[PDB]
Every structure is written in structure tokens, then in C-alpha cells.
Design an enzyme around this catalytic site. Sequence first.
Site: not given
Ligand code: NA
Lengths: 500, 500
Positions: B357, B283
Site C-alpha cells: 500500500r 516474514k
Molecule cells: Na508485505
Amino acid sequence: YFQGGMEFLVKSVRPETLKTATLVLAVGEGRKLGASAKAVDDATGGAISAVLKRGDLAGKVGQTLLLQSLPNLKAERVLLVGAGKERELGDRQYRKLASAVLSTLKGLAGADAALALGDLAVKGRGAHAKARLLVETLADGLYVFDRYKSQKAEPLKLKKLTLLADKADSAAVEQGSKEAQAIANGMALTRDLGNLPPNVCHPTFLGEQAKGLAKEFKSLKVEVLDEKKLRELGMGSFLAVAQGSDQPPRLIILQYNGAKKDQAPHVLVGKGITFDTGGISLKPGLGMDEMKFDMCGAASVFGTFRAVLELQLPINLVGLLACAENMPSGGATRPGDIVTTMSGQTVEILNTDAEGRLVLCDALTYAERFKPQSVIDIATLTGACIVALGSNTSGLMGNNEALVRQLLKAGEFADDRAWQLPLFDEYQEQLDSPFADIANIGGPKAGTITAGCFLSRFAKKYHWAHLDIAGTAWISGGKDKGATGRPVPLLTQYLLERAK
Amino acid sequence: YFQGGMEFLVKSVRPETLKTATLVLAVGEGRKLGASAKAVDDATGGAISAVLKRGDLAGKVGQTLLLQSLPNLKAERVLLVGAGKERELGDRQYRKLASAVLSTLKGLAGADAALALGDLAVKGRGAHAKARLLVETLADGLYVFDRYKSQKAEPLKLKKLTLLADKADSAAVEQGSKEAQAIANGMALTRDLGNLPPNVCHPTFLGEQAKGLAKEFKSLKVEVLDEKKLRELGMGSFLAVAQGSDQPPRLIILQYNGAKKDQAPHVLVGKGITFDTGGISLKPGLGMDEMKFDMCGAASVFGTFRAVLELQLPINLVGLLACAENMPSGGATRPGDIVTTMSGQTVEILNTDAEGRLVLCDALTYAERFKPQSVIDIATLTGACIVALGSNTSGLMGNNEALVRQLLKAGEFADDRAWQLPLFDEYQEQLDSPFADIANIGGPKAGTITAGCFLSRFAKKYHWAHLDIAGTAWISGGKDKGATGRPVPLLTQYLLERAK
Ligand code: NA
Ligand SMILES: [Cl-]
Ligand SMILES: [Cl-]
Ligand SMILES: [Cl-]
Ligand SMILES: [Cl-]
Ligand SMILES: [Cl-]
Ligand SMILES: [Cl-]
Ligand SMILES: [Cl-]
Ligand SMILES: [Cl-]
Ligand SMILES: [Cl-]
Ligand SMILES: [Cl-]
Ligand code: NA
Ligand code: NA
Ligand code: NA
Ligand code: NA
Ligand code: NA
Ligand code: NA
Ligand code: NA
Ligand code: NA
Ligand code: NA
């Protein structure tokens, strides 16, 4: 009737004695031939069964096997198309089957083909509903946009398609086919206008297109308002969008009175930004050619009218096409400008690329004079809608639950689906401005919703809904890049139901 | 009972003779005092009327005017709070009124206050439903997280809040208050776990928190599985997320059997990524401190259990908390890795930042063994959900319409709302991989939906729903930055209804 070079017929005759260049039959994956295919196989003395036993056609949806002359048939060719192994197809599989058939037939020199597909079952669809989907897929699959190609493809030999139906279903099939043909004609006009390059398709051109449609359809009345009239009406945010471009703006008004004068009209409001550079809030260069599709909202109002006019539906319909070109220039609107909309509400224009709502809000105020029973605006409004719902489902918002439900149901029937997003009052504060009544944009959160919230402030006087087609109005890349014609099928189905 | 330093009482006595440090009354904007306020005004000989006539309190929602001793009252102070001009308040206005009252009372030296607010009407809410909203807003409004501050605020003097209700409503108010207190206690645990910094709140810490909750609640059984057991179970995508971090992963299993052994359990599955760097798919730095909230899904399972355990609901409940830390390292999972999930499906991990997920899908497979009647996963899963629905509405998807409707209804009652997004089969092809059974990400279109589609491939054996709380689990900036405790109110209300 369909105008794109295809006649669609419905007949109730036996497939095995029908004279045709190509007879099309469905073949299941690992299940017995259906009634029609079995009757044809029997007529040939088992020739189709014998071919299938050899195993070249597994029967998966859309697979094909083409035979030439078979004994005792009047069909010059027999096209076998796989229908999978399920008892019923879904809409997607039915469309895929139909497109595979059409793709094969396009490449053949046969002048006609007969579809003996009545044994196919499609989930939740009877004869009329299946014919609507089948004929619309076939007719729209014939669309061509080649006016700027110096080398054009060879014209198709295929000019006639016959749907075989049992006599008990033939009236429903005929009705479905007639409606699907009108929808496909409307989609073709929408796609043409969307695909035109923006140096040709500007607001004045769209005005002349409306006048041409009134020449063709005596039941249509058209009025085209120029920038002087818009200024007389006080349409300040509409004018602010247009002022940076050399191209003058147009408000195009279409009126069709198919019902008694006592029936309130339905109003369609279309965003017609014929090109969107972003303005001073300039877009990046990558992919900005697809901003010629920023008038697809208005194009879909053209297309829905085109279908309604062909079907002569007993309804009263108004179209308002708010068209402008959004350009940077020494006189363009600047971020921070404050303008007075026709409603009297002042708007702080924080970002000049959120301009669709600025032409729409003045059109929504204009719509009040018609005392409408429903107002639907259609717009390629937010890239946020593509993040939310992708390219296959349009975003839908509104101020009336019954209307929203009617549009969802129409989209389901049409297989041109939308999905509701909420206009909860909590989202409205994102449009607060310290300087003006409304800011034209919220933050980066809930962008599709806050755009709908902005429009809702101009729609309080009537039942209103808003279709964000930023994701569904066109295909971005690849061989199939171009306008789709959506949401003409949803809108036309909505009006078909309102006409009953 | 609420644990955060506040006793909530319900009493049916006359406000004008109640001994209290502060009596709270509502005052309408430009409409007559309600029955309770009028009775108190009469008791003072018109002193409140006389003050209001002077005009300092316009009566807008949440405005206040504080009086000291008034003649013939046993209240040391009287707090007037504006209730606006409408006949009924909406939920937002009711919360705003309650928060304004609480903010004033917090700053006073009174040890208690009595709320004479029974005359307020709230749209669609009777006595129980109003008490649920009022007490939850008050109790959650008392939340404090200051364990890392060297200088702590002065403790509140306020320690008791009395709700005045007519005797005919007092049982409903008491019930609403009791449930709201349990919910607020659960929210406080959720918020604590969410607000803890990630060097303290790692998966092993969450395991010890579960063990501590079982010490407090004898009806709770807890099992904590470490990486060896996860590998024995074949939990390959869960392990792939965890492998780059020094912190070992944990699968925490909570079980509560409040109903007969023949009742199928409800399963809550929580994403507990205690910090998410993105991994190799790193990120950006800006705002990445808020990735400590990437375990708020698991935190909300803690909080929902905390509320259910206090209320002793007659239901069977299972919690599965899939906790890992997502770090870059010389052994971290790489984009392009292919792993085998516990279900046997292979997954191509195209982006290591779509890791929630990957721990959830193995937990969903694990949930099959409980033969559940409903499975709900809760996760801070996609920034796309914030684009779609903002910070005030959670995204909801599922494979069962009745369950989705039950959750929507619970969110409406709780005023902790969600909104359904569709899992149409057409979206599934975005997860196609040339190499593996599934890719872990779709494209930039419909990101919230394709994440739900990914999870749905592991939930086919039971009724399942999925809450994307990326936007609702925390507040990003400003004085109120921190975890919110949502969706504990929605989930607890869902289970309250399933317990009837
Ligand atoms: Na993530
Ligand atoms: Cl029929
Ligand atoms: Cl014109
Ligand atoms: Cl002009
Ligand atoms: Cl999509
Ligand atoms: Cl319909
Ligand atoms: Cl009651
Ligand atoms: Cl542990
Ligand atoms: Cl360990
Ligand atoms: Cl928001
Ligand atoms: Cl409920
Ligand atoms: Na099939
Ligand atoms: Na299908
Ligand atoms: Na724009
Ligand atoms: Na635009
Ligand atoms: Na925002
Ligand atoms: Na009010
Ligand atoms: Na309200
Ligand atoms: Na994450
Ligand atoms: Na995509």
C-alpha cells in the site's frame, strides 16, 4: 413497551412551554440554530444565543453544554448538544449524538427529559426511520448487567423520555418508537443470556428460559427435547458435540402463529453452544472466557421472538435453538470420528472445535417438517468471519438471492448491517473427505465460506440464509465488554417487512 | 494471434469429411449422441456407436476414449470425450472437458486436431462467450515455463487446433477466439514475469521489459522513473519501501492512445514488489519463496496491456507499475517511521510488511494528472483476503458503485471472478494514528478492508477500484505451483466492454 426502566412518549407541544427537568436542543457547528432551538432562544430573550456567543460549545457532534433555569422557560435545565456542520447526519453521527445526550442525562437527578431534536436531518431517513434509530439507541443504551456485582450503581433518576415531533410526523414517530422499544427489549434478553457465565447458562437453563417466556406470552408455544429424543430423531452430529460434557443437550422449539394457518412459517435456527472449549481440539487459554458468547446465535432467536411477541406481528414464526456444551473428557468426540447426521449424510469430524455447524446441520434437517418459506440460521461460527468483515458487519450467505437481499435491506434499515459472501460451487470441494460424505472443515482458506457451504448441504429443500455473527455478537474487551444483542435489530426488521 | 506455438482456426465444414490427425467429439452420459457425433457415427456405419455400446466410456465429464482409423473417415484418430448427463455444462465443467481434451492431444504425435464440440451447451453462454472460455482455456493450458530446466520436455507435435462451428455462428466464434488468444498471450507474459526468480526479476529488469514491449508495439509509449525522479516528485512512502534494498526502485509508466484525444483514459496501477521479505518486520521462512509473486499486480498490468495492444482496442489506457524490493538492512525503514506521501498525508509505518500500500498510494496520487475516468489498482496485498475469499475469487473494493459493478460483471463473463467487500466509513478509524495522518495497518480484524480503506484515502479525486489478488495470482504448491495470470482476463474484458 420498553421494560428496562424507561417510558418513551411522543408529544407535539411547543418546547418552550413544556414542563420538564431537562429540555434537550441541538446546536449546529457554525450554522444558525434550528427552528426549535431558535424558538426556545427567542422565549428566553436571547439567553441561549448569548451563552453560545461566548464560545464554550463549538458544536461538534456530541459536545454538550448544560444550562440551569433560563428566563421564561418551564424547563428546569436546558441541555445543548452539538450536531456538527453538515446538513444531514449519518447513522453513526446520529447514534453518537443520542448517546452523548443519554450519557449526560444519566448523571443528572432529573426524573425526565424532553428531546426537541426534530430539526435534525439524517441521510435517507424520514420520521419513522429516525425514530427507530434514536429510540433503539437510547433504550439499548440503558442496558445494565449487574446481577453478580455486590456493589450496584445508584438507580437512575431519569425515568421518562419525551420525543417532541410536529403533529404531522407524530404517528410515524410513535410507530418507530414502539417498534424500537420491542427491539430493545429483545436485545436486552439476548444480551442477558449472552452475558451469563457458562456455569449458570447451560442448555437446561436455556430450556427453562424458553418455558418462562411461554408463561409470559400466551401466544408462544414451547417444546424442549432432551438427549433421548434427539437420539430417537437420529441427530447424530448434534449428539456428538454434546457427548463430552456433563451437561445434557437441548433442542428448544418455539412456535408463534400470528398469521392464518395457510401462511408458511419463517424459521430461525440458533447456535446455542453455551460454552465452547474446542473439545479435544482444545482452544488456547487466552480469551477463552469469551466462548460463553458461543450461544449468542440462540440468544438472538430468543430476543427476536421477544420483540415479535410484544409487537404481535401477523406472521408464523418458528425458533429452533440447538444447545450443547463442548467439553474435553474421557468420552468426548475425537478428531477423525465419523457420525451420521439426521439427514443421513455422514460427516468426518476433523476438528472438534468446528462444532457449531454440527448442531446446526441437524437442526436444519429438523426444520424441513415446517414447510418454511424461509430458514435463517444465526451463529457465532468462524473467527475467519472477523478477519473478513471485522466486528461491525455480520457475514451473510444463502441459497436464495431474494432472501439474501431481504436480509441485507433489513440490516441497512436497522443499521445492524451484514454483507454477503459467495457460496460458489468451487468452494464445496474443500469439504471432500476420503472416508465420509462430508468433512466438517475445509482448509485455512475461505473459512467463513466453507462453513456456509457445509450448512448449505442441509438446506437444499427450502429458501435459506446464514448469519455469521462471530464478530458482531459481542465486544471483546474494555469497559464495554459483553454481548451486543445483534442481530436482533436486523432479524426483527426482516420480519416486520415480511409481516406487511 | 496466440504466440505460444498454436494456431487456432474456425471452420464450418462437415466433421465427417475433415482431414485431421484427431477429430474430437463429445459423448453424453446416458443420452443420445449429439448431432455432430451422430453424423460422424453414421458416416462410419455405426462404428462409434458399436464401441460405446461395449461400455468403456461412461461419459462422465472429461473421460476419454481414443480410436484410430475408422471406416470412411478422413480423421486419422477419433477422440471421444465425456460431457456428463446434464443438458448444459457450467463453466467449471466446460473448462474440465477442454483441459482433458488438451491433455490427451498433447501426448499424441498428431500435428493438428479438430474440435467438433458445437453441440455442447454451457449455462448462460452463446457462441462468442463459449469460444472465449474454450480458447482461453486451451491456449493458457499450453503455457510452459522451463527456461531454468537443463532437461526440457519434448516439443509438442500439436501445432494447430480447428474449432468447427455452424456458418451462422462462425463469426462470433472467430471473434471469441481472437479475443481469447490475445488474453492468453497477456496471461503468458504475466505468468512469465511472476514465475521469474527474484534475483532476475527486480525493478530495473521490469523497466527493461517495458521498454522491450514498446519496441514490439509502436502504439505503446513507455517512461521509466528512477529513484532520483521519485524523490523529486515527493514520493516518500514509495521511497521508504525501497530504501532497505540494494535494488533501486522504478515507477514504470505505460501509455496507449487508441481513442480520440478527448476520451479520458483508464488507469491500471500495479503493485510490483519484486520480492517481499517483510523488511524489518521480517516474514517467517516457511513458503517465503512465493513472495516473488508479490509483483503479480504489476505483472497483470503488463499482461492486460499486451492483450489490448494486440487487439488495438479504441481506448486510452495508462499503466503505472510501482516496483521495489522489500529487504532488511542497516538502512531499511523501521517500524514507527513516519513518512510524507506525495499527497502530503503523513503515514506512520507500524509494520514494514504492509508495504504494497505504501508504493501504491504514491502511484494513486500520481494518477491524478491523467484526469482518468477510472483507476484500478491490482495488488497481492493481504493474506487476510485468502482467509475471506480463498484462492478462487479476488477481493474487490472501490469508491464508485458503477465501476465496481462493471468489474464484477467482467469477472463473471471471464470466469475470473471477484467479490466486493465493503469500505464502510466505520472501518476507517482502524487506521487512526496518535502521531501521523494515517497508520499503515489496522488491527487483526477486517485486514483486507482496512488495506482498501488505506488506499481509498489517495483515490478520492476519481472513480477507483482495488483488486486484492493475494489468493488468485498464484498457485502455492504441487505440480502446478506458479503464477496464474489472473486477473488479466477480468481486466481485459472490462476494457473490451469500455471500448464499445
Ligand atoms: Na508485505
Ligand atoms: Cl411523517
Ligand atoms: Cl430444559
Ligand atoms: Cl436431560
Ligand atoms: Cl472491524
Ligand atoms: Cl427492510
Ligand atoms: Cl451466433
Ligand atoms: Cl529500468
Ligand atoms: Cl537507478
Ligand atoms: Cl479457496
Ligand atoms: Cl462484461
Ligand atoms: Na453534521
Ligand atoms: Na455519520
Ligand atoms: Na468451536
Ligand atoms: Na463454537
Ligand atoms: Na483451505
Ligand atoms: Na453434464
Ligand atoms: Na460446471
Ligand atoms: Na507485499
Ligand atoms: Na483490528
